[PDB]
Homo-oligomer: A and B are copies of this chain.
Amino acid sequence: SRLNPTIFEEEEKKVLTRVKGTDVNVVINFLWNIRNGFTVNAVKSMNELKNIINQLEEDLEKLKSFYKNWEEHKNFQGETLLVLSDLDSTLKVKDLLIEGNDLEKLNYLLDLYIKASIYDKALSLARELPVAICLNKVGGGMFDDKNEKYKHCNEIVTSYLRLRYSGLMEFRNTLMHGGLSTDMKPNVDKDGNITPGKIVTKNKIEDFVKRELRNYFDKIVNFLSSA
Contacts and interface: CB of A to CB of B under 8 A. Distances in A.
A164 B225 CA distance: 14
A214 interface: no
Interface in A153-184: 153, 155-156, 159-160, 162-164
A128 interface: no
Interface string A202-227: 00000000000000000000110111
A25 B159 CA distance: 44
A12 interface: no
A40 interface: no
A73 interface: no
Q: How many copies does the complex hold?
A: 2
Interface in A76-100: none
Contacts of A163: 138, 148-149, 152-153, 156
Contacts of A156: 156, 159-160, 163
Contacts of A152: 159-160, 162-163
A82 to B, nearest CB: 56
A223 B160 CA distance: 12
Interface string A105-131: 000000000000000000000000000
* 10 A-B pairs closest in CB distance: A152-B163, A155-B159, A152-B159, A223-B226, A156-B159, A152-B162, A223-B227, A149-B163, A222-B226, A156-B160
21 contacts: A138-B163, A138-B164, A148-B163, A149-B163, A152-B159, A152-B160, A152-B162, A152-B163, A153-B159, A155-B155, A155-B159, A156-B156, A156-B159, A156-B163, A159-B159, A160-B227, A164-B227, A222-B226, A223-B226, A223-B227, A226-B226
